[PDB]
Design a protein around this ligand. Structure first.
Ligand SMILES: *[C@@H]1O[C@H](CO)[C@@H](O[C@@H]2O[C@H](CO)[C@@H](O)[C@H](O)[C@H]2NC(C)=O)[C@H](O)[C@H]1NC(C)=O
Ligand SMILES: *[C@@H]1O[C@H](CO)[C@@H](O[C@@H]2O[C@H](CO)[C@@H](O)[C@H](O)[C@H]2NC(C)=O)[C@H](O)[C@H]1NC(C)=O
Ligand SMILES: *[C@@H]1O[C@H](CO)[C@@H](O[C@@H]2O[C@H](CO)[C@@H](O)[C@H](O)[C@H]2NC(C)=O)[C@H](O)[C@H]1NC(C)=O
Ligand SMILES: CC(=O)N[C@@H]1[C@@H](O)[C@H](O)[C@@H](CO)O[C@H]1O
Ligand SMILES: CC(=O)N[C@@H]1[C@@H](O)[C@H](O)[C@@H](CO)O[C@H]1O
Ligand SMILES: *[C@@H]1O[C@H](CO)[C@@H](O)[C@H](O)[C@H]1NC(C)=O
Ligand SMILES: *[C@@H]1O[C@H](CO)[C@@H](O)[C@H](O)[C@H]1NC(C)=O
Ligand SMILES: *[C@@H]1O[C@H](CO)[C@@H](O)[C@H](O)[C@H]1NC(C)=O
Ligand SMILES: *[C@@H]1O[C@H](CO)[C@@H](O)[C@H](O)[C@H]1NC(C)=O
Lengths: 381, 409, 413
């Protein structure tokens, strides 16, 4: 049996790592030469089905109901997807083909085609002192392009907050070039941000809070920790050191890292190739229509089995005993105010070196509301 | 007893999600009932906005608005709206509803300092008194239909449409449509966090068809709840904003109580006299449903009719100023009656399991300027629409999707 | 030894004290007669940066002039006062404020990579040097009045007025109005969850009357806090947009520790050495008030004047370029000293009652397009008046969630 106790401290406090992304992964005019054929086919489909003025898997119509089907090789079976709206038909079909094109492009070129830190960041400001694009680390995500991480870089000491509130946290102004969005992939305009440990993988595709343009987003946060006990007391691990699954994220262990690593490994077993949405495991290739022509149906079967917990990943992976969380309080206001547009937008475009539109920009504030760090500890009796 | 607290992630049934438009009715469908009340509401606005400027006085006399003027304590006075024509807004002037009973030989006032509140609450009462006279099978035909509401639906990668939703009529909000209720089909499990595996909806607000003087916020009402429970939208629901994509991360937060030997809570509803239900479905018990179901017993004893915003017995009648003239005052008495409050709170009891779905809200503009015109052409063609008439809505599990507090001996 | 316990549910209790502020400290139409010299100089500075190819009160400029520092030549970096003729914005160029002291004989820069932040900080410093010279009971009259802001209010079923709010001058945000503070009246309880039984507000931002170079963000500031506690709204507060109905669901998450024999926290202000400068508000003890009093003490001792953003003891004066010429230099020195911040942390005890008003915030457009005309026409009559617009009005609801408390408490074994 155990005794729970709580320790609260007020003292200068380490700042999290903050990974910021554009919602759109690549400046469209830069990738349009790869996606030209897919754009032509998509606009032909829109003109054929809906009259809009504007090859292993065609788009189809059913008794309008629009869809496509993913087929196996060694038997006649297929998984057929029929959508009651053309938006889902076109978006999902386009994303199938888009991810099977981008999986074949080399990473060295994808990193060069996506955004630079000097493009994404108009200004940065931390602890009341200047900050620059050189203070951010590159984080290339296969579905968001170049994301950039604050306060996480090698052989530099972690930045720590000694004063609470809006004026002494991270303040950053983001440029979100929405005339260069992809017409068929990206249907939401803004940015994303994750708050995480320096040694934690952000998973910015899952749980990122979203940043709206022509707005200031004020992410105030408090820090809370929990420390469980491992076996005998609970079937739990302090580290990834005693679970059978190999971690492929090059980041400190957590249950979602373990579950995704398990599933990505099961795909390299069953389908012969890795899912492009996730990091590449050792000595494997990402799936694509020309080398792995039937991987679509393989993934469908495999994920159906995963949801029914038949692959074992949910029972093999374990919860991590030490837990740290920043409880965010997101709130929004209009920015610039109608009186300040007269001078903010000209000076912001001078700081880039056309005039910026108010909807091309977003301001973000991330700060500790107070230096109170809570913690809940479990200990043997 | 003593508790233990835990947090984590696990495969579990996805919430039931109720989608409901903010305006209860389509004005183009219902304005023939509300015509004579609208003509009077325009005149009531003339005597407030432009006092220097034919009425149905039977609609007015039910509960007039009155000016209460007490700037001169020696002689405070109250006046019906029907050196200047101007009704006073100054400190000491109140605008109030004269609720009355027994041929107006007894009356009571509901006080407002602001005219925008007084007019909102006056109309909603006069509208309610009209809806109470329309049979629900016909009143449900004047509200937003499911096939116009749900433009597109996608659960992870399973396509859905308005026929995957169970329809209910919730009298405060009109038609509401429930996803994944688990009532006539097996509920869907979800085994992954993040947006890509959640529920993805595109919804039409139909803002050009709202009722002008009623339900003055634009969006969809939303509520996450248990399978087979009835959605009390008013009490734990939220709005979602049009012209945006709203992203909602879900955490299932539970309290498990120890039960009978240690506490007064109940395993299910079999111990409690919950006679009145909002709908014909076999929904689960909840203390909130019991208190509302108990109020109607006391109102059908006292006022001889049931209230429109509440459930109704198998053979009783809703309250009308035609059949039950005193009902407007009689209802206001029950709200204030201590005996009514304490006797229902005594009859009903807590549940042993107590589940609440916590939410983390985020927003972004939708569609993108590049995808806007093919998006809205496809949505226009499929109805044979504009940015601020459309909602996009994502509901998904967080990285840690449950938190539990469990009592033990 | 102490044993923790946990309690969760709904309980009837005092409704949180809500403080409302505008995002602009002043009404420009009422304060432009002080700021005209600084505004003319700020627009000349903007012209010098943005349109250089195209007299001024240089006594304002010479207080802390902005300089370009150009390091494109590592063997000859050159620093130039703002006053083709283009200022540099290339990768080697930065922009700074020259903070000089001691008859200007020895001084330092404060550095910025971007002109937008340099101009923001320069103007805030200059405007503070102007506001610090106005007596506060006159400075209150050129900020936003409760008459203008609170268009309508209604708590549960009880009507309410701007006279139900206690007024304070919070110098970074001007006038602020505190509902249910429990200071000179009995605080109101509530006993049911949901918006139907909570605080309902309609507020007017007056967005067109903002100070152009101070009020870059538009909305109200909000903060929920205990009765008889001072609202440190620049740390704790959230915003709310105009043109929307914002609904805030509150849960009171509390953590109560044992006192001195078991932990170093305090239940009173007693035996803390710092003199409390917020005592004239009669508010309860708080670590935030102690830290700010500690800073203001160091400021009054080192600079010989007190800073404008903080309260002031009875004999002292606020810092002015006229009376205390070195004040900007020594204030930046103190403001940036992490050792000084740690000294105050090492000097103030924190309170044993930790409490957090946790909020779930949701939004929707208000009024709807169908119900727009008559609502704005009627709202125009809610004041002695028309000068009203959609971009100015907030609708705001604050209420208790189904469970409105989560208390974690220590007890002696
Ligand atoms: C941003 O990055 C720069 C360069 O790495 C940091 O610059 C150093 O700052 C410290 C003081 O904080 C100085 O003592 C060093 O001399 C600076 N180095 C250089 C090369 O200029 C800067 O601290 C970083 N700022 C933030 C907020 O992370
Ligand atoms: C929406 O409803 C349809 C039926 O109207 C569901 O389609 C069925 O799904 C099951 C698997 O769960 C299949 O075995 C059936 O063959 C399907 N029927 C048809 C006619 O296709 C669909 O799954 C529902 N979608 C959601 C998200 O609930
Ligand atoms: C502000 O920036 C200036 C210019 O980069 C800094 O001044 C230089 O500091 C280095 C290191 O002490 C000296 O070797 C140079 O001679 C200085 N140049 C000039 C023109 O003075 C200054 O240190 C920075 N100050 C702050 C507080 O960031
Ligand atoms: C003239 C008159 O009756 N004025 C009433 C007052 O008596 C009552 O106490 C108050 C509360 O409802 O409302 C008003
Ligand atoms: C000081 C005073 O007059 N207080 C009353 C309050 O007791 C009453 O509950 C309320 C009802 O509207 O009106 C006000
Ligand atoms: C007034 O309205 C009522 C409905 O509430 C209707 O029955 C009646 O005929 C109307 N009378 C006139 C004179 O319009
Ligand atoms: C309550 O929770 C327990 C948890 O194990 C579960 O077994 C039970 O079915 C739930 N429902 C009821 C009505 O007890
Ligand atoms: C400059 O402006 C200040 C106010 O900011 C004023 O007091 C002073 O007299 C002005 N100086 C001159 C020379 O006009
Ligand atoms: C502080 O915490 C204790 C915990 O028992 C509580 O009794 C007290 O009311 C709290 N507040 C104050 C002001 O002491």
């Amino acid at each position: 049996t155990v005794s729970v106790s709580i320790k609260v401290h007020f003292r200068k406090l380490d700042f999290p790592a903050v990974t910021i992304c554009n919602i759109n992964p690549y400046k469209y005019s830069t990738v349009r030469h790869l996606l030209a054929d897919l754009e032509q086919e998509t606009r032909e489909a829109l003109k054929s089905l809906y009259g809009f003025p504007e090859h292993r898997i065609p788009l189809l119509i059913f008794d309008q109901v629009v869809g496509f089907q993913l087929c196996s090789n060694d038997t006649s079976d297929c998984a057929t997807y029929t959508f009651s709206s053309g938006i889902n038909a076109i978006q999902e079909w386009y994303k199938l083909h888009y991810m099977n094109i981008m999986a074949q492009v080399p990473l060295e070129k994808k990193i060069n085609m996506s955004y630079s830190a000097e493009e994404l960041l108009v200004t940065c400001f931390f602890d009341g002192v200047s900050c620059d694009a050189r203070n951010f680390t590159l984080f290339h995500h296969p579905m968001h392009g170049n994301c950039y991480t604050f306060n996480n870089r090698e052989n530099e000491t972690i930045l720590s907050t000694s004063m609470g509130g809006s004026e002494y946290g991270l303040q950053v102004i983001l440029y979100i070039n929405e005339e260069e969005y992809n017409p068929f992939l990206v249907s939401s305009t803004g940015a994303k941000v994750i708050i995480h440990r320096q040694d934690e993988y952000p998973f910015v595709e899952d749980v990122g809070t979203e940043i709206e343009t022509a707005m200031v987003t004020s992410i105030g946060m408090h820090l809370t920790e929990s420390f469980k006990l491992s076996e005998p007391y609970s079937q739990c691990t302090e580290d990834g050191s005693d679970v059978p699954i190999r971690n492929i994220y090059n980041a400190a262990y957590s249950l979602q890292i373990c579950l995704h690593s398990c599933f990505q490994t099961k795909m390299v077993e069953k389908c012969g190739c890795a899912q492009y949405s996730q990091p590449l495991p050792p000595a494997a290739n990402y799936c694509n229509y020309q080398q792995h022509p039937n991987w679509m149906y393989c993934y469908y079967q495999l994920h159906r089995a995963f949801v029914q917990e038949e692959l074992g990943c949910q029972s093999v992976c374990k919860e991590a005993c030490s837990f740290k969380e920043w409880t965010l309080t997101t709130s929004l206001a209009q920015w610039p105010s109608v009186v300040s547009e007269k001078w903010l937008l000209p000076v912001l475009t001078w700081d880039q070196g056309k005039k910026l539109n108010k909807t091309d920009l977003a301001k973000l504030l991330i700060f500790y509301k107070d230096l109170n760090q809570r913690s809940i500890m479990e200990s043997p009796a | 007893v003593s508790v233990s607290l835990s947090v984590g992630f696990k495969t579990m049934d996805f919430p039931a999600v109720t989608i409901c438009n903010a305006s209860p009715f389509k004005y183009s469908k219902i304005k023939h009932l509300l015509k004579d009340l609208d003509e009077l509401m325009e005149a009531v606005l003339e005597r407030i906005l432009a006092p220097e400027l034919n009425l149905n006085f039977s609609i007015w006399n039910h509960t007039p608005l009155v000016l209460i003027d007490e700037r001169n304590p020696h002689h405070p006075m109250v006046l019906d709206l029907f050196a200047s024509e101007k009704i006073c807004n100054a400190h000491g002037c109140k605008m109030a509803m004269r609720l009355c009973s027994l041929n107006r030989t007894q009356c009571t006032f509901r006080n407002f300092t602001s005219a925008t509140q007084a007019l909102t609450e006056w109309y909603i009462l006069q509208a309610t008194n009209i809806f109470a006279q329309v049979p629900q099978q016909e009143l449900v035909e004047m509200s937003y239909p499911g096939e116009q509401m749900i433009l597109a639906c996608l659960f992870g990668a399973e396509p859905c449409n308005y026929r995957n939703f169970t329809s209910i009529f919730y009298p405060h909000y009109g038609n509401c449509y429930i996803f994944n209720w688990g009532m006539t089909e097996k509920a869907l499990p979800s085994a992954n966090p993040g947006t890509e595996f959640g529920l993805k909806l595109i919804l039409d607000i139909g803002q050009e068809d709202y009722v002008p003087f009623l339900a003055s916020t634009a969006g969809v009402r939303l509520m996450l709840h248990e399978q087979r429970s009835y959605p009390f939208i008013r009490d734990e629901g939220i709005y979602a904003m049009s012209g945006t994509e709203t992203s909602i991360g879900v955490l299932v937060d539970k309290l498990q109580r120890m039960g009978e030997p240690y506490s007064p809570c109940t395993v299910n509803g079999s111990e409690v006299p919950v006679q009145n239900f909002y709908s014909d479905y076999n929904t689960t018990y909840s203390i909130q449903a019991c208190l509302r179901s108990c109020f109607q017993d006391h109102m059908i004893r006292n006022c001889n009719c049931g209230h429109y915003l509440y459930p109704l017995p198998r053979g009783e009648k809703y309250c009308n100023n035609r059949d039950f003239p005193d009902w407007a005052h009689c209802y206001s008495d029950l709200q204030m009656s201590v005996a009514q409050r304490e006797t229902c709170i005594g009859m009903c009891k807590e549940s042993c399991n107590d589940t609440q779905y916590k939410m983390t809200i985020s927003m972004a503009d939708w569609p993108s300027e590049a995808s806007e015109d093919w998006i809205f052409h496809v949505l226009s063609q499929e109805r044979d629409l504009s940015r601020k008439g459309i909602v996009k809505l994502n509901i998904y599990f967080q990285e840690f999707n449950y938190r539990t507090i469990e009592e033990s001996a």
